[PDB]
Design a protein around this ligand. Structure first.
Ligand code: K
Ligand code: K
Ligand code: K
Ligand code: MG
Ligand code: MG
Ligand code: MG
Ligand code: MG
Ligand code: MG
Ligand code: MG
Ligand code: MG
Ligand code: MG
Ligand code: MG
Ligand code: MG
Ligand code: MG
Ligand code: MG
Ligand code: MG
Ligand code: MG
Ligand code: MG
Lengths: 77, 149, 106, 271
RNA sequence: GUUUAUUAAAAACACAGCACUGUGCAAACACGAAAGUGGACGUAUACGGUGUGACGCCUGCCCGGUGCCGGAAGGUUAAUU
């Protein structure tokens, strides 16, 4: 499923609205990318399906803190 | 990204620099190699106290690199036998694996990424020049001779 | 048994390997019970027109007596050898042995 | 080889066949055989995804060595065999250690001929070398695009490619389409051209011959109803529309290539 | 040969043959939110699409309109700033 593993961002639903205000159903997808993160505390690469926002969260907090939060919610990697 | 350098890198700075680099440069190169660490409070403080330790380790490895470059320059001639047809032309090639294995056969060990063959992969026999680096500064040279098997 | 005149020109950066060529082709003819009648290494000389952007070539003249099949294998070797840039194979009526003008003049 | 049938029946009048008397008349080599069962042009959703596929003669599959990676060991050609899976004949060959393999049959190969593979093989048809060692100007077939992957270019009967240039780590090839393509020079190819070049001279002669090969009838779009096909409809024969596929894309000139990943390897497109 | 099971079997459909066009392989295309699968364990003498319809003699002129291919110097032109 298209879920960011760090922030939990999901596809959501909204409307295409045209000029004549015709509304059709549409989805908004997260900007997901698979990425290998280096973990300095266990000499390893960990692959995460992460949004670009979650990449910025990992840059702000550190990879070890984020992996501790994912271990707290479950969410094995 | 505001990063602190753990070693001298290119045209960025020396050991100890509050340097602003691009986020991909910090994320994909400088942090997964032992060259940099982000500017976090703990990180900043840690480095300050470890600064001495680093300076020392930073040198012990330049002295070992100079010793290995001196052993390469003492060696200076390595022979590889391979299949050559007529006109002194190799049917195969002398790979980086073959150059590294011949250097380990001649002396104490040298891994694969240390060789900097400037032209190619030695498609012909004769005397060739191969460069070796064990650090960011030392660039030592080896004559390699390829003979027919 | 037919008599042939062989001229071939080697690329001048391969001129250090032309004794190997001559001994190889003489061994190839004499393994087929053939005779070499004249061997002449004219060396490096300038060309009248450029050939593969080269201004000089190494010249070797042979006069052999050999079977047709080993002569055909010789020109197949000539075609698939990168070092020789041009060769000519000529039938001659008899065996010749006297010196060519380009060693007679010197 | 190319034989015209006598008109003893109207389905026999236009039949033109090809006969190869040196093909093996017996059963194929059993350890290189494999089942391949028909799809009907149906994918794993059970839906027709390619039209006009169905029926025909059931066929076993022959494991053909497209890789030719048994280097340095010569092989003699045992026999030439018909292959139902492809337009080219294949050759059962026997290596010097006792291993038997199937290769594609080149043009001038028969029983008793010797083939070899590797970097030091001689330049003769049926021999496989990396393209660094093949001289420029040669005619080759069974051409790899990635080194070690196996031959993918010029496998069909009568086909071949030309090595026209060699720049560094790449060679330039002229393909049968007329396109010019870069290929890595460490890739392998087999000298010569693929045999059975008279295969395109056959005439099937009747509807049933194509039904034996497993092709179902094509219905023209202009014979359909407008619900079935964009060309469908009309009182009598009408058209009055630009010609398109059944899914509406224009089909008489519109280009459909869109691969920016392999565009760096195309020197000149076909014309 | 095929067709309106149940008012139409035909001149309709198909057909071998012909032509145009797409497609260099992770092919085009198709089914599929996707993974994947068919195409194909095939590789341009191959595969898809379209029109024509054995065979024989042949297939003239028009690129202004619509489409498609190619060009890109100018003119116009989106988000962004
Ligand atoms: K119609
Ligand atoms: K009827
Ligand atoms: K027009
Ligand atoms: Mg079809
Ligand atoms: Mg066949
Ligand atoms: Mg048709
Ligand atoms: Mg109708
Ligand atoms: Mg319907
Ligand atoms: Mg419609
Ligand atoms: Mg109609
Ligand atoms: Mg009408
Ligand atoms: Mg009938
Ligand atoms: Mg009825
Ligand atoms: Mg009736
Ligand atoms: Mg019609
Ligand atoms: Mg007309
Ligand atoms: Mg016009
Ligand atoms: Mg245009």
């Amino acid at each position: 499923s298209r879920v960011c593993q760090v922030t939990g961002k999901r596809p959501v639903t909204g409307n295409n609205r045209s000029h004549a205000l015709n509304a059709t159903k549409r989805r908004f997808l997260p900007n997901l990318h698979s990425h290998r993160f280096w973990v300095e505390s266990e000499k390893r690469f960990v692959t995460l399906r992460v949004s670009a926002k979650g990449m910025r969260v990992i840059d702000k907090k550190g990879i070890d803190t984020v992996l501790a939060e994912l271990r707290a919610r479950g969410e094995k990697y | 990204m505001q990063v602190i350098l753990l070693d001298k890198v290119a045209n960025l700075g020396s050991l100890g620099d509050q340097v602003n680099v691009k986020a991909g440069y910090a994320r994909n190169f400088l942090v997964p190699q032992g060259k940099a660490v982000p500017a976090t409070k703990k990180n900043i403080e840690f480095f300050e106290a470890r600064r001495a330790e680093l300076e020392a380790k930073l040198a012990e490895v330049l002295a070992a690199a100079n010793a290995r470059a001196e052993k390469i320059n003492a060696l200076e001639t390595v022979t590889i036998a391979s299949k050559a047809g007529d006109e002194g032309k190799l049917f195969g090639s002398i790979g980086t694996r073959d150059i590294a294995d011949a250097v380990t056969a001649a002396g104490v060990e040298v891994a694969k990424s240390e060789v900097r063959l400037p032209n190619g992969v030695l498609r012909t026999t004769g005397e060739h020049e191969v460069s070796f680096q064990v650090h960011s500064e030392v660039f030592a040279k080896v004559i390699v001779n390829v003979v027919a098997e | 048994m037919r008599h042939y005149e062989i001229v071939f020109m080697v690329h001048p950066d391969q001129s250090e390997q032309v004794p190997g060529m001559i001994e190889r082709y003489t061994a190839a003819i004499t393994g087929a019970e053939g005779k070499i009648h004249r061997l002449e290494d004219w060396g490096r000389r300038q060309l009248a027109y450029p050939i593969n952007k080269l201004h000089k070539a190494h010249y070797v003249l042979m006069n052999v007596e050999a079977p047709q099949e080993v002569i055909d294998e010789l020109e197949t070797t000539f075609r698939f050898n990168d070092a020789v840039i041009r060769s000519m194979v000529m039938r001659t009526k008899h065996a010749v042995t006297e010196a060519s003008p380009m060693v007679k003049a010197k | 080889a190319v034989v015209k049938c006598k008109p003893t029946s109207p389905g026999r009048r236009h039949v033109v066949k090809v006969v190869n008397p040196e093909l093996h008349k017996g059963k194929p080599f059993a350890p290189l055989l494999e089942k391949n069962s028909k799809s009907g042009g149906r994918n794993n959703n059970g839906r027709i995804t390619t039209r006009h596929i169905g029926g025909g003669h059931k066929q076993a599959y022959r494991i053909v060595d497209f890789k030719r990676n048994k280097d340095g060991i010569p092989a003699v050609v045992e026999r030439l065999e018909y292959d139902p899976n492809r337009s080219a004949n294949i050759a059962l060959v026997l290596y010097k250690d006792g291993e038997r393999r199937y290769i594609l049959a080149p043009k001038g190969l028969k029983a008793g001929d010797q083939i070899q593979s590797g970097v030091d093989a001689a330049i003769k048809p049926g021999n496989t070398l990396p393209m660094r060692n093949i001289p420029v100007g040669s005619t080759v077939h069974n051409v790899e695009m990635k080194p070690g992957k196996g031959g993918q270019l010029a496998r069909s009967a009568g086909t071949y490619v030309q090595i026209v240039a060699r720049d560094g780590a790449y060679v330039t090839l002229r393909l049968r389409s007329g396109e010019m393509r870069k290929v890595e020079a460490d890739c392998r190819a087999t000298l010569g051209e693929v045999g059975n070049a008279e295969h395109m001279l056959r005439v099937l002669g009747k509807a049933g011959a194509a039904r034996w090969r497993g092709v179902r009838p094509t219905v023209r779009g202009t014979a359909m109803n407008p619900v079935d096909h964009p060309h469908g409809g009309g009182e009598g024969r009408n058209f009055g529309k630009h010609p398109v596929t059944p899914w509406g894309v224009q089909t008489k000139g519109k280009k459909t290539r869109s691969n920016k990943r392999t565009d760096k390897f195309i020197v000149r497109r076909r014309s």
